[PDB]
């Protein structure tokens, strides 16, 4: 499935993922496109920060017809 990530400029990128993928795995894909290491990424979905050891399904991100996440820089 596809997800959209609002980057630090207010623009977006797209990632291809699976619902059971871990948050850490998603951050690795964001690092590939944006050059921000996973330890400096904060991902927000539906107002909640996503935890590295959790999966996308833990947050029901796949239930939305369009999956919208927001990237913030730690610090």
Numbering used by the authors: 1 to 75
Direct quotes from the study:
The Ser/Thr protein kinase PINK1 phosphorylates the well‐folded, globular protein ubiquitin (Ub) at a relatively protected site, Ser65. We show using chemical exchange saturation transfer (CEST) nuclear magnetic resonance experiments that a similar, C‐terminally retracted (Ub‐CR) conformation also exists at low population in wild‐type Ub.
Indeed, 1H‐15N BEST‐TROSY 2D spectra (bTROSY) of 15N‐labelled Ub L67S showed 73 peaks implying a single Ub conformation. The chemical shift pattern did not match wt Ub, but more closely resembled the pattern seen for the phosphoUb‐CR conformation. The structures highlight important consequences of the Ub‐CR conformation. The Ser65‐containing loop (aa 62–66) protrudes from and lacks defined contacts with the Ub core, is flexible judging by B‐factor analysis and in Ub L67S adopts distinct conformations in the two molecules in the asymmetric unit. Unlike the common Ub conformation, where this loop is predominantly in the “out” position and Leu8 contributes to the Ile44 patch, the β1–β2 loop is in the “in” position in Ub‐CR mutants such as Ub L67S; in this position, Leu8 contributes to the Ile36 patch.
